[PDB]
């Protein structure tokens, strides 16, 4: 018993098709990874499957090819394939086995032998009338197990002939036969195959193996980045099925229409219709054996499955050989002048022995038949009219003798008669089918109720799935089903038990993969959205679902992969996932009290940046050439649609443009072109990193370089280039730029006056409520803050992708969906096949036009998504682009008082960059620092008046008081300057008694 | 459920109410400094007259009407309760959302 | 066709721009902040909100 | 097709409220966060906080 | 590759062919094509275009 772990192995090409440098799904058979493969060493036969994976490193070549028959003899057409060193010769013809078939040493196909530490790996298999062989020979190192690597096996050969190949065996030439062979059975699998440039498949992965590897699959990246990912549907199967139809109650008089102890006579046949019961025919069946029981219409068992709403008995009493009589086509006295069946009768014709009971021994002379008509009978008729034959061409006149004969005469039946003569009662069942409902069916089945467990039900008629409960609620009498608001069905009656069942929907949810980078593990965590954790590593319920593979911890960390319900999880580090409870912030408790201020004491200089999109890539379709392309049968057809290309035409030249005016919108701000002086100093700041490089021919900042480089045909599809360029876009920039160093805001709102840059800056602070005094004093430092901050903007932009992540998503939005647009040309949408030609040439006109209309209304439908989706991301990109010119105007331009609006504290100034398809903003903050806690009082009383700051606040360091600006603490006297005295003394609330100088 | 599910938001309507309130306490204690920074205490009482300044209004007005500005701030609070509860088309809004 | 594909991408955009609405407008301030236990604020009434 | 619909009504409405969560996220930085001198941006009157 | 006869691209687009009779590679690149705009002044201006 030697069994081997499978490892990546199997895969071969799957069809003629080159691909360079590209990853393509393919649904085929495949040797799943790390499988069940069983290595062998008399000889059963071993069956074929879908597909056979044999891996053989024997040397010796004790094995000399396979025999594929299905019976290994002359019964059928045996697969007999030699692989000697002269040639392989793969032979069908029939050929007479030998007692033992082993040699010294219709449909031939003579090629090169197979054969050359040689790993053989062939794939057999056999679909659609072809049989497909592949092979692969590689160099092994020393090994007794199938190798650890990835090896593509290349077609070998094909072979027209497609017979039922049930059972392969290996040939035999030698009797011990102790052979080194593994052998796999391939399965129907999604594998997804990693190309290279030189055409071969490198790598490979396999969908339904690991939660991980379809999340590979489902991405179509063999590299995942961290986060949830939405992979499969999760649905419990219905275990079980139940049928509950009504009590058989009621049932077919059968028992009557036998065991009537009298039949009548066969001249007037006695006809019984039966209509409105229950179909039983366990008595039927339960009655005496049966000389004759032929059924012509319905197999016996199939009368039960067919409903018929007319069923018509005639039970008669006729001799024994006149039974042969009684069948469609049939020639005789009794079948022309007694009963005649018609040529197409549908029915079953029961006959008994009734010896037993009607046999006297005087003579039974109560049954007659009839033995004179003037013609044959018309079928199913009763003749009963008994006047005498005119058989004499002289009038009977009414009374008989010569030449007229009674038309009756009648069987003498007696026990001692012999077979052929005895009576034999005779119940011919006929069935009827008119279109009219019928009613009348047979003993409809039933099984035991299954409860708590999803089922498959189907209840007096009503099909569905789901989980049976006890329902509380009560319905009426006459009532069967309970329908809810949204006309589903939610609970039913059961027919044979009047019980109230609630149906409930079988479990069903999402599964995603909460994962790390692939860079970082391969573990991966299970999320099942919405279901409970017993309808399914450790396992934990969230609010979410239920969450396999992640422990839960009770400390607080911040949210690095989102789950749920505050629910959060991360590789933290055996040590692996863990969930917890997202933390909000750091928990911060700010010292009030009535008369305690803090003033900062130095700041911050800090320089942000803020990503916008402005445009999107512009996009034309040419409707005919995408639907039809270079067909006119197609294009005829679809001039019938109407004007739908006309109106997405329309629609997609809006949208371009829409383009080109959000871009004039954001950066044509200005209408001169301002140029920054040649000796570029600016009191100390650098703005080297913003303003052009004239080095390099592009023209361009080096943050914007930066930008450039990181964000950085078809059918119809078209991509039209923007109104203005790059280097316009950048001319743009460098003018926004130089006007705010040259002349501060002055520029947006009129001439441009130029202004030395730290006086600029000076009236920013006085912008943001600080004097200028502290700029003056504090000039060396704040510009080297700002170089600092500046220079630290190329890292942080640099180093982390994620910061340009919103205008590389646009991009790839686009480009996701044009190929979505050109991938669905090969979807055939119901036709024969997505190419028009092969649907033209293949098919007549008058059945073509259906298969291209079919693909006309699929491909015409693709289009309308496709324009609908650029309508609506062209509204989210103009929204995103007058956020960016708004930005433009107030914080570049000017200087903004809303918070947030222009980063994240105290806005000076704004600094615009170009970037592929938007705007990154430098904006530089004050951020307060070093804040000081002192005692503040609301005004201060001398001479009996009260004494309110003009600008500051009243602040105490202990035993003196100052009053400060609120922004900076730069404590200055109390003077009649900088107060005004606005009351008395007594109406404020917390005033404080001191001395104000003048 | 016929396949279509809802899918929890990620933040609870504890974690947003712990947001409302670290917000109101900011700005109960600090004023509009915790936007811009560190948040920096000070006394209720400035930072309305601080608003004030900032609307063109003296300081002198709030701290001479203290009482009456509180008043008057109190009853329209206890005002808003009402209005909100008496008419429902006043959350007309989110509810049509829904 | 790839439809399917389509319709679950589009639905899950709009659940992330959800969850980043709620985060856009509800998570600005960085410090979780706790009023003081003794709650005088002037004669403010800062009870109901 | 009913998919489809719901999915393209779906989207128009996620613009709408992403618009109103754009807004709200201004009104919380520039009313909550800070005083207004935008005239009827935050309530009727002089905007106090 | 020997057993290769089609190549397509990312978009499933046939880029190469093998020639049948003789084995080499052969690119196939679509036939020009695009669309044709007509620049005017008003007609109430000029007729030229
Ligand atoms: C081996 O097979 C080839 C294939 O037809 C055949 O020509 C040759 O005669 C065979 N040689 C032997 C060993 O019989
Ligand atoms: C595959 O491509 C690489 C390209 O660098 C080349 O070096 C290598 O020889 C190729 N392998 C072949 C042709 O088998
Ligand atoms: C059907 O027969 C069962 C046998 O126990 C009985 O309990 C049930 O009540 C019957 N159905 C009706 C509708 O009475
Ligand atoms: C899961 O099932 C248990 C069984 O008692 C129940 O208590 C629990 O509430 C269920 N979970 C949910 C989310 O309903
Ligand atoms: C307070 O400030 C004064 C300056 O006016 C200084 O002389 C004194 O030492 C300081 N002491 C305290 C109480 O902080
Ligand atoms: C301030 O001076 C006045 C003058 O009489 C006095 O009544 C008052 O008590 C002083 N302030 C304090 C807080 O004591
Ligand atoms: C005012 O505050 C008191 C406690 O200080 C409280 O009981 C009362 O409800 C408040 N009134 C309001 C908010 O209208």
Same mark, same amino acid.
């Given at each position: 018993?030697?069994?081997? =772990?499978?490892?990546?192995?199997?895969?071969?090409?799957?069809?003629?098709?080159?691909?360079?440098?590209?990853?393509?799904?393919?649904?085929?058979?495949?040797?799943?990874?790390?499988?069940?493969?069983?290595?062998?060493?008399?000889?059963?036969?071993?069956?074929?499957?879908?597909?056979?994976?044999?891996?053989?490193?024997?040397?010796?070549?004790?094995?000399?090819?396979?025999?594929?028959?299905?019976?290994?003899?002359?019964?059928?057409?045996?697969?007999?394939?030699?692989?000697?060193?002269?040639?392989?010769?793969?032979?069908?013809?029939?050929?007479?086995?030998?007692?033992?078939?082993?040699?010294?040493?219709?449909?031939?196909?003579?090629?090169?032998?197979?054969?050359?530490?040689?790993?053989?790996?062939?794939?057999?298999?056999?679909?659609?009338?072809?049989?497909?062989?592949?092979?692969?020979?590689?160099?092994?190192?020393?090994?007794?197990?199938?190798?650890?690597?990835?090896?593509?096996?290349? !077609?070998?050969?094909?072979?027209?002939?497609?017979?039922?190949?049930?059972?392969?065996?290996?040939?035999?030439?030698?009797?011990?036969?102790?052979?080194?062979?593994?052998?796999?059975?391939?399965?129907?699998?999604?594998?997804?195959?990693?190309?290279?440039?030189?055409?071969?498949?490198?790598?490979?992965?396999?969908?339904?193996?690991?939660?991980?590897?379809?999340?590979?699959?489902?991405?179509?990246?063999?590299?995942?980045?961290?986060?949830?990912?939405?992979?499969?549907?999760?649905?419990?199967?219905?275990?079980?099925?139940?049928?509950?139809?009504?009590?058989?109650?009621?049932?077919?008089?059968?028992?009557?229409?036998?065991?009537?102890?009298?039949?009548?006579?066969?001249?007037?046949?006695?006809? &019984?219709?039966?209509?409105?019961?229950?179909?039983?025919?366990?008595?039927?069946?339960?009655?005496?054996?049966?000389?004759?029981?032929?059924?012509?219409?319905?197999?016996?068992?199939?009368?039960?499955?067919?409903?018929?709403?007319?069923?018509?008995?005639?039970?008669?009493?006729?001799?024994?050989?006149?039974?042969?009589?009684?069948?469609?086509?049939?020639?005789?006295?009794?079948?022309?002048?007694?009963?005649?069946?018609?040529?197409?009768?549908?029915?079953?014709?029961?006959?008994?022995?009734?010896?037993?009971?009607?046999?006297?021994?005087?003579?039974?002379?109560?049954?007659?038949?009839?033995?004179?008509?003037?013609?044959?009978?018309? !079928?199913?008729?009763?003749?009963?009219?008994?006047?005498?034959?005119?058989?004499?061409?002289?009038?009977?006149?009414?009374?008989?003798?010569?030449?007229?004969?009674?038309?009756?005469?009648?069987?003498?039946?007696?026990?001692?008669?012999?077979?052929?003569?005895?009576?034999?009662?005779?119940?011919?069942?006929?069935?009827?089918?008119?279109?009219?409902?019928?009613?009348?069916?047979?003993?409809?089945?039933?099984?035991?109720?299954?409860?708590? &467990?999803?089922?498959?039900?189907?209840?007096?008629?009503?099909?569905?799935?789901?989980?049976?409960?006890?329902?509380?609620?009560?319905?009426?009498?006459?009532?069967?089903?309970?329908?809810?608001?949204?006309?589903?069905?939610?609970?039913?009656?059961?027919?044979?038990?009047?019980?109230?069942?609630?149906?409930?929907?079988?479990?069903?949810?999402?599964?995603?993969?909460?994962?790390?980078?692939?860079?970082?593990?391969?573990?991966?965590?299970?999320?099942?959205?919405?279901?409970?954790?017993?309808?399914?590593?450790?396992?934990?319920?969230?609010?979410?679902?239920?969450?396999?593979?992640?422990?839960?911890?009770?400390?607080?960390?911040?949210?690095?992969?989102?789950?749920?319900?505050?629910?959060?999880?991360?590789?933290?580090?055996?040590?692996?996932?863990?969930?917890?409870?997202?933390?909000?912030?750091?928990?911060?408790?700010?010292?009030?009290?009535?008369?305690?201020?803090?003033?900062?004491?130095?700041?911050?200089?800090?320089?942000?940046?803020?990503?916008?999109?402005?445009?999107?890539?512009?996009?034309?379709?040419?409707?005919?050439?995408?639907?039809?392309?270079?067909?006119?049968?197609?294009?005829?057809?679809?001039?019938?649609?109407?004007?739908?290309?006309?109106?997405?035409?329309?629609?997609?030249?809006?949208?371009?443009?829409?383009?080109?005016?959000?871009?004039?919108?954001?950066?044509?701000?200005?209408?001169?072109?301002?140029?920054?002086?040649?000796?570029?100093?600016?009191?100390?700041?650098?703005?080297?990193?913003?303003?052009?490089?004239?080095?390099?021919?592009?023209?361009?900042?080096?943050?914007?370089?930066?930008?450039?480089?990181?964000?950085?045909?078809?059918?119809?599809?078209?991509?039209?280039? !923007?109104?203005?360029?790059?280097?316009?876009?950048?001319?743009?920039?460098?003018?926004?730029?130089?006007?705010?160093?040259?002349?501060?805001?002055?520029?947006?709102?009129?001439?441009?006056?130029?202004?030395?840059?730290?006086?600029?800056?000076?009236?920013?602070?006085?912008?943001?409520?600080?004097?200028?005094?502290?700029?003056?004093?504090?000039?060396?430092?704040?510009?080297?803050?700002? =170089?600092?901050?500046?220079? &630290?903007?190329?890292?942080?932009?640099?180093?982390?992708?994620?910061?340009?992540? &919103?205008?590389?998503?646009?991009?790839?939005?686009?480009?996701?969906?044009?190929?979505?647009?050109?991938?669905?040309?090969?979807?055939?949408?119901?036709?024969?096949?997505?190419?028009?030609?092969?649907?033209?040439?293949?098919?007549?006109?008058?059945?073509?036009?259906?298969?291209?209309?079919?693909?006309?209304?699929?491909?015409?439908?693709?289009?309308?998504?496709?324009?609908?989706?650029?309508?609506?991301?062209?509204?989210?990109?103009?929204?995103?682009?007058?956020?960016?010119?708004?930005?433009?105007?107030?914080?570049?331009?000017?200087?903004?008082?809303?918070?947030?609006?222009?980063?994240?504290?105290?806005?000076?100034?704004?600094?615009?960059?170009?970037?592929?398809?938007?705007?990154?903003?430098?904006?530089?903050?004050?951020?307060?620092?070093?804040?000081?806690?002192?005692?503040?009082?609301?005004?201060?009383?001398?001479?009996?008046?009260?004494?309110?700051?003009?600008?500051?606040?009243?602040?105490?360091?202990?035993?003196?008081?100052?009053?400060?600006?609120?922004?900076?603490?730069?404590?200055?006297?109390?003077?009649?300057?900088?107060?005004?005295?606005?009351?008395?003394?007594?109406?404020?609330?917390?005033?404080?008694?001191?001395?104000?100088?003048?």
């Amino acid at each position: 018993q030697s069994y081997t =772990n499978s490892f990546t192995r199997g895969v071969y090409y799957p069809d003629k098709v080159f691909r360079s440098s590209v990853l393509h799904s393919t649904h085929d058979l495949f040797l799943p990874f790390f499988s069940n493969v069983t290595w062998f060493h008399d000889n059963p036969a071993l069956p074929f499957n879908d597909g056979v994976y044999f891996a053989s490193t024997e040397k010796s070549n004790i094995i000399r090819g396979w025999i594929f028959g299905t019976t290994l003899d002359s019964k059928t057409q045996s697969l007999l394939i030699v692989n000697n060193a002269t040639n392989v010769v793969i032979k069908v013809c029939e050929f007479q086995f030998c007692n033992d078939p082993f040699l010294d040493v219709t449909f031939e196909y003579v090629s090169q032998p197979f054969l050359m530490k040689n790993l053989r790996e062939f794939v057999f298999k056999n679909i659609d009338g072809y049989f497909k062989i592949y092979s692969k020979h590689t160099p092994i190192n020393l090994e007794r197990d199938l190798p650890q690597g990835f090896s593509a096996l290349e !077609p070998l050969v094909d072979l027209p002939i497609g017979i039922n190949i049930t059972r392969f065996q290996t040939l035999l030439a030698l009797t011990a036969g102790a052979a080194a062979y593994y052998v796999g059975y391939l399965q129907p699998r999604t594998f997804l195959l990693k190309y290279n440039e030189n055409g071969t498949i490198t790598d490979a992965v396999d969908c339904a193996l690991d939660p991980l590897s379809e999340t590979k699959c489902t991405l179509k990246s063999f590299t995942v980045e961290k986060g949830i990912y939405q992979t499969s549907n999760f649905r419990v199967q219905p275990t079980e099925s139940i049928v509950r139809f009504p009590n058989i109650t009621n049932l077919c008089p059968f028992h009557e229409v036998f065991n009537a102890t009298t039949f009548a006579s066969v001249y007037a046949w006695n006809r &019984k219709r039966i209509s409105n019961c229950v179909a039983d025919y366990s008595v039927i069946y339960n009655f005496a054996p049966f000389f004759a029981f032929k059924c012509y219409g319905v197999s016996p068992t199939k009368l039960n499955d067919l409903c018929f709403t007319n069923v018509y008995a005639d039970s008669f009493v006729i001799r024994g050989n006149e039974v042969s009589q009684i069948a469609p086509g049939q020639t005789g006295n009794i079948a022309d002048y007694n009963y005649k069946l018609p040529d197409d009768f549908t029915g079953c014709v029961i006959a008994w022995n009734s010896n037993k009971l009607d046999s006297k021994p005087s003579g039974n002379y109560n049954y007659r038949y009839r033995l004179l008509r003037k013609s044959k009978l018309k !079928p199913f008729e009763r003749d009963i009219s008994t006047e005498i034959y005119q058989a004499g061409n002289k009038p009977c006149n009414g009374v008989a003798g010569p030449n007229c004969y009674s038309p009756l005469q009648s069987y003498g039946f007696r026990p001692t008669y012999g077979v052929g003569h005895q009576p034999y009662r005779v119940v011919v069942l006929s069935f009827e089918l008119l279109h009219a409902p019928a009613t009348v069916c047979g003993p409809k089945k039933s099984t035991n109720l299954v409860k708590n &467990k999803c089922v498959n039900f189907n209840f007096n008629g009503l099909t569905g799935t789901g989980v049976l409960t006890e329902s509380n609620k009560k319905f009426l009498p006459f009532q069967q089903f309970g329908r809810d608001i949204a006309d589903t069905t939610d609970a039913v009656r059961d027919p044979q038990t009047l019980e109230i069942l609630d149906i409930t929907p079988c479990s069903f949810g999402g599964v995603s993969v909460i994962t790390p980078g692939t860079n970082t593990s391969n573990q991966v965590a299970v999320l099942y959205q919405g279901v409970n954790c017993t309808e399914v590593s450790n396992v934990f319920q969230t609010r979410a679902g239920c969450l396999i593979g992640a422990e839960y911890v009770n400390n607080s960390y911040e949210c690095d992969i989102p789950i749920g319900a505050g629910i959060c999880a991360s590789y933290q580090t055996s040590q692996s996932i863990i969930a917890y409870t997202m933390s909000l912030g750091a928990e911060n408790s700010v010292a009030y009290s009535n008369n305690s201020i803090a003033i900062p004491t130095n700041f911050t200089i800090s320089v942000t940046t803020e990503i916008l999109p402005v445009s999107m890539t512009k996009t034309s379709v040419d409707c005919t050439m995408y639907i039809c392309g270079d067909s006119t049968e197609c294009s005829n057809l679809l001039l019938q649609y109407g004007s739908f290309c006309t109106q997405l035409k329309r629609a997609l030249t809006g949208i371009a443009v829409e383009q080109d005016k959000n871009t004039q919108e954001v950066f044509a701000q200005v209408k001169q072109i301002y140029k920054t002086p040649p000796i570029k100093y600016f009191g100390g700041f650098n703005f080297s990193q913003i303003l052009p490089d004239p080095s390099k021919p592009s023209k361009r900042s080096p943050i914007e370089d930066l930008l450039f480089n990181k964000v950085t045909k078809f059918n119809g599809l078209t991509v039209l280039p !923007p109104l203005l360029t790059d280097e316009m876009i950048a001319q743009y920039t460098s003018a926004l730029l130089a006007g705010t160093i040259t002349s501060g805001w002055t520029f947006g709102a009129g001439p441009a006056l130029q202004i030395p840059f730290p006086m600029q800056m000076a009236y920013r602070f006085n912008g943001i409520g600080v004097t200028q005094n502290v700029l003056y004093e504090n000039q060396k430092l704040i510009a080297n803050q700002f =170089n600092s901050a500046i220079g &630290k903007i190329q890292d942080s932009l640099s180093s982390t992708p994620s910061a340009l992540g &919103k205008l590389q998503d646009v991009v790839n939005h686009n480009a996701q969906a044009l190929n979505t647009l050109v991938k669905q040309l090969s979807s055939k949408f119901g036709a024969i096949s997505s190419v028009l030609n092969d649907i033209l040439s293949r098919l007549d006109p008058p059945e073509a036009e259906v298969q291209i209309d079919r693909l006309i209304t699929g491909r015409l439908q693709s289009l309308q998504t496709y324009v609908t989706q650029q309508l609506i991301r062209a509204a989210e990109i103009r929204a995103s682009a007058n956020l960016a010119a708004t930005k433009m105007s107030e914080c570049v331009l000017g200087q903004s008082k809303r918070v947030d609006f222009c980063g994240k504290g105290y806005h000076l100034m704004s600094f615009p960059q170009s970037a592929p398809h938007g705007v990154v903003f430098l904006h530089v903050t004050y951020v307060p620092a070093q804040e000081k806690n002192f005692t503040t009082a609301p005004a201060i009383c001398h001479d009996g008046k009260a004494h309110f700051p003009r600008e500051g606040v009243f602040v105490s360091n202990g035993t003196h008081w100052f009053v400060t600006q609120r922004n900076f603490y730069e404590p200055q006297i109390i003077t009649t300057d900088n107060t005004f005295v606005s009351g008395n003394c007594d109406v404020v609330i917390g005033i404080v008694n001191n001395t104000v100088y003048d």
